């Protein structure tokens, strides 16, 4: 029930259905192939197999383009029903049948096998949703000889780069800035997938060190050319000397095998005539297990690896297989949290405030996976780091040993700090937080600390504030807006059930890495709530009007904290005079997308209750 309704919520895959270029490009591959089979089949009858049919959109496009029979397969049963409803209430009802099975389980589609297979079954890493087996087994079992598939062919490109920015998402943080600081040893990093909108990297934040290299070619029309595990050593020519901080990755697929019509995931700065924004697909960043340097105009090799679902890259003469996180950091922290710690360790203004606040004092740190106490140890007489998570305690233990910070103690519970400290310092940062306001756990550890030592116990930060701002994003809004009619097909049935299963199983406010989404801001940041650092934690409730909404399509929200004399922002860092906001890359911000009833209003009313009882903030948006 709840697992079933949550997955119906995901089923839109953000902007997938509204990806105009995706839709054009599959339409084009179907026109080309249906027209070949129109000529080739002695009777002119063309059987299309659409695998992964979702709403049935592609099947509608096949039948309207003149396929005589379309069979559509959807493994996810509720989307199977959705499709059945949509296609059976359309003019092509008679031509289209929906079977709710995974294509791999089907054994015959009856009576005839397919002339053509269309499948949109790809994610950012191309192969990560099963494409390989889906095609290979559909060709073995479900297709005529010379079956044509849309798309027919695909490539995966990597580009080496030197980038301080990207390094920050991967480096084990270095308390003192030099290498060879190796606090935790050497680590590969995970083979978790790091998806990023590389188009929003500013040109100064990276440098390409070679032309794109073709890591893999796939061919989705020949059974035998689809091999699940492969490794190839690949060659290129540096056009700059530098170090390979990261490997940018993306793919492109050829819709009809003509070398002309493509979905191309190349970033805006490297896809000059086939670039369209989207979110359900993006580009990806991979890291080499060890450092690799490169000089022009030298030849270098990257070893290119994949299994059925996954890609990874290794150096020559190092061993080929997939490398996991061994330091515990890459597997515990999200990418943006690694960036957060590396950024904090390099932030001279932050470090100065921490020294001035700690000097000669016993400091206690609260947080969960917060590294602050390691900085407080420079100047503090004593640091008690309180961290409830065992694995972060083990990490901190390795850092204190490695950097010989003998004035630091690490303990598990706030109620175990029996000596009273001079100051409590926090970011605050708790790894558990899905929202910038979920770091409000802070208020409760403070309540406990003031109950145990007194109410005049010094604590920093001493004020937190929830803020919001109206923004007009260029594109991001389409992850959330209603699908309505698409390619002339009414898909509103999908919106009703998608609405329902989002209403029930989803949060009102989304979470997004806003630095990755271009927009312009339409008003001043506004304060919503303000949190004093008190004896007792109190519920609070407010109602604020957010004007300027008629030219905006979203409301970002974030926390700011007054840490001694400085201000820490988990979201907005500044706004250019042109109105372009800059967002902290070490956190996800909250963004609300005005519900469809509200698309039009020139101002919305924001309601928020911080509920002492849950530690949470509920929002509703409406009225005015
Ligand atoms: N081998 C398979 N057989 C049937 N459904 C599959 C499948 N692999 C993935 N899926 C389903 O197919 C979908 C991919 S999303 C693409 C949907 C549709 N063709 C469109 O382009 O709009 C998801 O609904 C997933 O449930
Ligand atoms: Zn690691």
Curated annotation (Swiss-Prot):
Residues 1-312, 317-624 form the SAM-dependent MTase PRMT-type domain. It comes from the Eukaryota. InterPro entries: Arg_MeTrfase, MeTrfase_PRMT7, PRMT_dom, SAM-dependent_MTases_sf. CDD domains: AdoMet_MTases. The active site is at 120, 129. Arginine methyltransferase that can both catalyze the formation of omega-N monomethylarginine (MMA) and symmetrical dimethylarginine (sDMA). This is Protein arginine N-methyltransferase 7. The gene is prmt-7.
